[PDB]
From a paper:
The residue R38 is placed in the N-terminal 3-PG binding domain and is a residue important for the substrate binding and its correct positioning towards the co-substrate MgADP. Moreover, together with residues K215 and K219, R38 is critical for the charge balancing of the transition state, directly interacting with the transferring phosphate group in the closed conformation of [name]. The crystal structure of [name] contains ADP but does not contain 3-PG, in line with the role of R38. The absence of the 3-PG ligand could account even for the variant reluctance to crystallize in the closed form since the binding of both substrates is required for the stabilization of this conformation. Taken together these observations justify the dramatic effect of [name] mutation on kinetic parameters. All the variants display a reduced catalytic efficiency, particularly evident for the variant [name], that shows a decrease of eight order of magnitude of the kcat/KM value, mainly due to a dramatic decrease of the turnover number. As shown in the structure, R38 is located in the 3-PG binding site and interacts electrostatically with the carboxyl group of 3-PG, hence it is critical for the positioning of the substrate in the catalytic site and for the stabilization of the transition state. Accordingly, the substitution of the R38 implies a dramatic decrease of the kcat and an increase of Km. In this regard, R38, replaced with a methionine in the variant [name], is placed in a critical position.
Author numbering: 2 to 416
The structure:
Amino acid sequence: LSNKLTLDKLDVKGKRVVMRVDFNVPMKNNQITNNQMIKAAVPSIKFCLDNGAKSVVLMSHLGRPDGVPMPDKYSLEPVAVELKSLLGKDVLFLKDCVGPEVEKACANPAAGSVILLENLRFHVEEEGKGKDASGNKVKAEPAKIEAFRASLSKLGDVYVNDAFGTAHRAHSSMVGVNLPQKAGGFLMKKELNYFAKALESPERPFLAILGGAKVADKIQLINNMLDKVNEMIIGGGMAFTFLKVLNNMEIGTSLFDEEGAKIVKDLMSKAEKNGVKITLPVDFVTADKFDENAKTGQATVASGIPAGWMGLDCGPESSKKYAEAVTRAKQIVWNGPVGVFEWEAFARGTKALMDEVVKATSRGCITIIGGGDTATCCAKWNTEDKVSHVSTGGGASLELLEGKVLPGVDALSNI
Ligand SMILES: Nc1ncnc2c1ncn2[C@@H]1O[C@H](COP(=O)(O)OP(=O)(O)O)[C@@H](O)[C@H]1O
């Protein structure tokens, strides 16, 4: 991860820059409800402009068109408008992202042109698959995927990828742009710096906080983290599988991963061999059903959860034990809330934990927040600036934590 060319080292003078960005912003009726994702890209674009780029060609996706043109539903046009404001400068919107018209527009544009192409996932060749009118799955054609990729490549002299949250997929805009320099943008650079350090040479003690719902789909996540951490909190729905298996806890109607249950002792076994201290919750906020407005109660590992009730958050004693581990940590990676954060009644455990993680940052702890749900919590409670790094990609950060090679990152130029 440390070895990749980045925009700041990329000579852009006189050069057409084709830049993959993440402009998948929240929307209601083709009006942008939060422009944060667009503003995050501005530094990369403005850098190209300020250093004499002939053009910047922006490409991205939005919504779920699924390989079909939906310009009434998932057009990037509104985003071109918003971008005009943010840059203080015209953005040319083109109605497609490939083909002879688009290539002609991009071939030798007026010096300093900013161009936004239309949604990449209007074409089946981006993701390599999609759906038709009736919702039947359809596959893309190999020769067409090739031509789509060659068309994207014509649009610039150099390539910048600043869409970390898509770099876990081998999509055409991630891996298909064949130019002699392919560099990470300023957002990508951040992602690579933080996760490279945490995976290759973290501060010690290194704590991982892993939350979620099921166990069986995080074996490799847990396995790879146990190769590298000094401590690991387990929370969220996951924990009840560990507790039933390890302590014969009665869990009522709480999530139970029947498959995951059978490898729990194997995971602890590995932790023991490596000297990883595992901190599991010891008490819970319970709900009579999986509903935002369910009746609430309280339970401990000792009491167990009564029949017909489920544990949707940790309780105050668990919060302390989590806090003891956070206090010891010099580096933290947090991927996954420890309760049903979406519903206020079961968000306290995650909010409290978030406060401890903020306080740790103040004292010099390195704190990395995974994308997806953990980063939503940071947005929702105004702590994006109070941790060291909030990741911009859920699936992407998770695959890095699993120890995988990300196609989009791997395709970047070295040194
Ligand atoms: N105790 C719990 N019971 C049920 N769901 C939980 C609990 N704690 C957290 N969650 C939920 O887990 C979800 C995140 O699950 P996810 O990260 O997708 O795990 P998985 O990939 O195993 O489904 C969140 O929507 C959150 O509301």
